[PDB]
């Protein structure tokens, strides 16, 4: 993932304002809502019967927070993404059987939360940077498949 000097600085700046305790949960939540079938991988999380149940579910919030954690791990090592996500890939890929297409969906859903929580500060330029970031995380997330 190449980010020009300006991008790297603008990316981090917004990411530093990201409510590490609410955004991860809203991203995972939304993924579960907008793309229903993804719920099948989370049958142990409890209630997911309604949009309000999903967003308000404790295990969705707690886990989503771990998800953002992984993303930040990616933001800190954009040059060693495959080594950074080698552990998570074998899990999703060979242990959980998650199809790669869902990585791209979550990556995109996060971008939407970000746009919703930051508004006009999430400029088209800012978006473009985050789109290379999410693609890189998703791509590295599927390496044990390529």
């Amino acid at each position: 993932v190449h980010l020009t000097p300006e991008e790297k600085t603008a990316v981090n700046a917004l990411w530093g304002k990201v409510n590490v305790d609410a955004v991860g949960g809203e991203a995972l939540g939304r993924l579960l809502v907008v793309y229903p079938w993804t719920q099948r991988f989370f049958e142990s999380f409890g209630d997911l019967s309604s949009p309000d149940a999903v967003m308000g579910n404790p295990k969705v919030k707690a886990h989503g927070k771990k998800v953002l954690g992984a993303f930040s791990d990616g933001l800190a090592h954009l040059d060693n993404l495959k080594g950074t996500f080698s552990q998570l890939s074998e899990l999703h890929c060979d242990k959980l059987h998650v199809d790669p297409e869902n990585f791209r969906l979550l990556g995109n859903v996060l971008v939407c939360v970000l746009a919703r929580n930051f508004g006009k500060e999430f400029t088209p330029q800012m978006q473009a940077a985050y789109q290379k970031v999410v693609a890189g995380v998703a791509n590295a997330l599927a390496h044990k498949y390529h």
């Binding site: 809502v33 907008v34 949009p51 995109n108 939407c112 508004g119």
Partner: protein
């Protein structure tokens, strides 16, 4: 396939766009051009420079097309037969690009109308935009 609850979310949410229908269509377009550069290959002779008038104008039509789509959300194939003739027959736009713009529209909405972008409306706008993408990438004459 849209549910009776999906249509209801779309209609509620695309109604708040009001006069900012192609201020939002221009943004999603610019967002798309900047975020996913290959999409510009479909606009060879367009001035895609930042703040271009041609992209603004083109953003209006896009937006109005969706408004007309919302209005006939239950007869889209017939409703959008012309756009289908344009994107499917004449321009042969690869399906992946409709996913790119759709996503960019979902960003212009979450940015401009946060209180409308509930999870249920998000998921409903996504399905709705996928249905419009199918209709425009399908030859059904």
């Amino acid at each position: 396939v849209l549910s009776p609850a999906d249509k209801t979310n779309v209609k509620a949410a695309w109604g708040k766009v009001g006069a900012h229908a192609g201020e939002y269509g221009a943004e999603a377009l610019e967002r798309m051009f900047l975020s996913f550069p290959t999409t510009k290959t479909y606009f060879p002779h367009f001035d895609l420079s930042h703040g271009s008038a041609q992209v603004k104008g083109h953003g209006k039509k896009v937006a109005d097309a969706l408004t007309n789509a919302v209005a006939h959300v239950d007869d889209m194939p017939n409703a959008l037969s012309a756009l289908s003739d344009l994107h499917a027959h004449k321009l042969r736009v690869d399906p992946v690009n409709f996913k790119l713009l759709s996503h960019c529209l979902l960003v212009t909405l979450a940015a401009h109308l946060p209180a409308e972008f509930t999870p249920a409306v998000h998921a409903s706008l996504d399905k709705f935009l996928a249905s419009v993408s199918t209709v425009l990438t399908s030859k059904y004459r």
